[PDB]
RNA sequence: GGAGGUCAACAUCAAGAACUGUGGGCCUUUGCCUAUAGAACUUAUAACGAACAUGGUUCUUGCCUUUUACCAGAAC
RNA sequence: GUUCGCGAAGUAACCCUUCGUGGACAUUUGGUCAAUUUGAAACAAUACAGAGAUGAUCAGCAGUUCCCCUGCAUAAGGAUGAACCGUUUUACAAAGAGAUU
RNA sequence: GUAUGUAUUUAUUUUUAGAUACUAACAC
């Protein structure tokens, strides 16, 4: 069917972006893989 | 055909007769933006419709017919339409053919051309969901009959049957004596929508019986969307129906899938 | 429409654009109903316009006169201080009024020479020029304000709102940066747990 | 950028038989019927002159996750309601693949943002004792019809007509208990 | 749109609040076109929003500078004569209308009622013979091939005798000081310094 | 084809006292030197406007409980 | 409906009218939206409650939150804006002494 | 001469004297 895409001129008075409305969202954190966290006391506590 | 097809639709209400906007004094002062009332809260605002339809009497051809529009005039469903044959939308009760035309687009939106919402509504309100095809209307506030008590429930049952019966092809009806509710079920989603918008806020008994001329003081009957049926019987019945229909469309899947190869 | 849309139906506007409460207000009302300089400023401004447009109306009704008119709009444009109350919401406008008084005196002496102390007058060019240029000034200012008022009215106020350090909350922030900075060190000296 | 870049998803069905089509693109339209977040909207008309107008309801994300059509909200391939295709699939295997959806708000508003791709998507006067549409249909073709009554709790009820009813008496009984009502 | 309570207005209402941002501009364009005393009624080009959201006056007044000064000074003299003349000069009351009276509709009251003569001046037949005719026209010279560009009305051109008459009329508003050297320490650069 | 328009779009309008094109020579396109043609609008008591408003940041003040609203000078 | 033209008829003497026909001129608007109860403004009123640090009365600034409101605001207010003021168990071991298999 | 907060469901979803007292926009 093809297509042709065309913008519509807004009535300048009416709000442009009819749906832009401040709302807050919690995004998920999508973890695909794990990043290995790779690193290399006794009397010490008496000091610390 | 002889009834509806030939005879062009007749204006239900003169435009001067239509109700005014600005419903009356639910509060202290009027409000321009939202159309409601300002301070204080008057006793809850609901009222019987001054209007109703008359399926064979009013319904007739209109401009949508020649223009091939899909969607039905709701002001007709309320019998309040003032545009008569000039109306842009169809005036007549939904049949199987026209639902045949809507069938592609009946999924997202009702027969009146209004998008459905996802979750229904807290109280099972106006328009349904596009998740679940629901053909079953809850009839409540049966005191739309006002205060007349009746010889039996066959009064209520019989009367309701004769009400909705006009509006479309009914699969079943059950009135409940204990808690006042009818449950009415249709062939088609479309007729359910149409009937819901048609019979909301309406009265009962005869064009004249007893208190008839005082009917307009009544509250009017809720027609809402109905929940599932908890009893095991109809639950079996649904499960089976879903089964056999799933089976039926598997035929399509394998016919066009067979054409896919 | 902007008043009711905000939900306040108990503030009445008259037809001279004075905004009065129609009721005694609970405190919550007085908080909801304090309107900013955007609205009020624009209200005062229209009130000026309506005022003049009215004088010309009463001329066309025949109710007035030719000369009484010109004296009229002269009287307006000079006495805006007294007739409006725009001077409340931008105090800067007090410059124009001072200007529009001075012209008055300069104009009167040439006009009034040899004849009279009375009201007869009606050379309104200069004052008109002043008010007009002042109005050039606040076009962008009101576009900005009322732009924010209405975009906030449809779209809700911003959720982020970071807030800068100023004279009042400084010491608090200084405390805060400090306690953090000590947390880092004393966590990084310790051996482990 | 993020919202525009994915192109729309439209069925071939509802998009009509026209060779070339003109569709409008609004960069912030209504929110989804589902996720309740803004997106980019598309008009079009099937016919050039067709009065009716088609408006994509859901997101691109909220669609892609479910693998459906934005105008139809039918499955992208089989043209099936979502609540069905997952039942067919659920018939194979045993019990699964139901699409669990998002009450509250930021449950859903949250949910649309993950890349999960969804459970469903991955595979893709005569008294007669012992519905009403069937009775009225069969009795409708053989004579005059006025009203029917059945109480399924009682499993029996009236059939009333306005002679022709005796024409019905040929096939009515035992098909079914049918007698002449009082 | 005066009465709107219907649902059909739900966009137009949104449309109103939007225009609230552009109003002060419309107040400017309206108010710089004031009709001036010698004119009875200006007629302007407005540009309106199709839903009746707001109405701009789209024009800018252009006036030949010498002619404009002549006009305005003629009115000046007429003002003085009239203030000397009549004993009781009655300054109209402010505001013109009371708060409860809705602004009367122009299409009814005003449009039928005839304009009631403006300032002008008696002029003179003999002396001003050149400028007597066109001096008080709304736009002084519109159709002339020689005297002005066109109806677009920029780039005026005149003759000597006209400029002599305009130069005559404008004496009360004319600069009058014929040499530079009079301003000695009053020029700009002496003020900056 | 001529006159216009309270019509539009696209160019251009603050700088070595200042623009552009072209011919020729050197370096190796830029750039320098030389030759030639045309330069609308705006500029010397300096500028598109013979007119004149507002805002932001930063300093200095002025009112002076604090914030908006402000006092009156400067620079950007 | 205008104009170019052709043919027929009539008035006519190539003109005036009627008729028929060829060609040119002119070429796809609008809607995200349908007109009161069932797709959604909060206020107010009534009842109950009754304002942080403290022994007690009073200024306040912040900080965290999927709470925001008034404000043009990245000033500032909204009780120091509100909520917070509670529930609370395992990276678990080592040594010694007594009872049972 | 208390912000502020909580609740405001009506229309019927299938099977004998008084002391020690606490407090009171009530009286310097
Ligand atoms: O201050 P005053 O000595 O009374 O001067 C007044 C006064 O002018 P100012 O108030 O500007 O100084 C009047 O104005 P208001 O009393 O209304 O403020 C003004 O009358 P208008 O207001 O009608 O102009 C009047 O004008 P006039 O000179 O015609 O009397 C003028 O008089 P003097 O300046 O001559 O005293
Ligand atoms: Mg403070
Ligand atoms: Mg605060
Ligand atoms: Mg406190
Ligand atoms: Mg406080
Ligand atoms: Mg706080
Ligand atoms: Zn209709
Ligand atoms: Zn979505
Ligand atoms: Zn589709």
CSV table of C-alpha atoms (C1' of nucleotides) and ligand atoms in Angstrom, one decimal, chain B residues 73 75-76 81 87 89 91, chain G residues 35, ligand 7:
chain,number,residue,atom,x,y,z
B,73,UNK,CA,-26.8,7.6,15.9
B,75,UNK,CA,-29.4,10.3,19.8
B,76,UNK,CA,-31.6,7.9,17.9
B,81,UNK,CA,-32.2,12.9,17.6
B,87,UNK,CA,-28.8,12.9,10.3
B,89,UNK,CA,-25.7,8.4,11.2
B,91,UNK,CA,-31.4,5.2,12.3
G,35,A,C1',-26.1,17.3,21.3
I,7,LIG,ZN1,-29.7,10.8,14.4
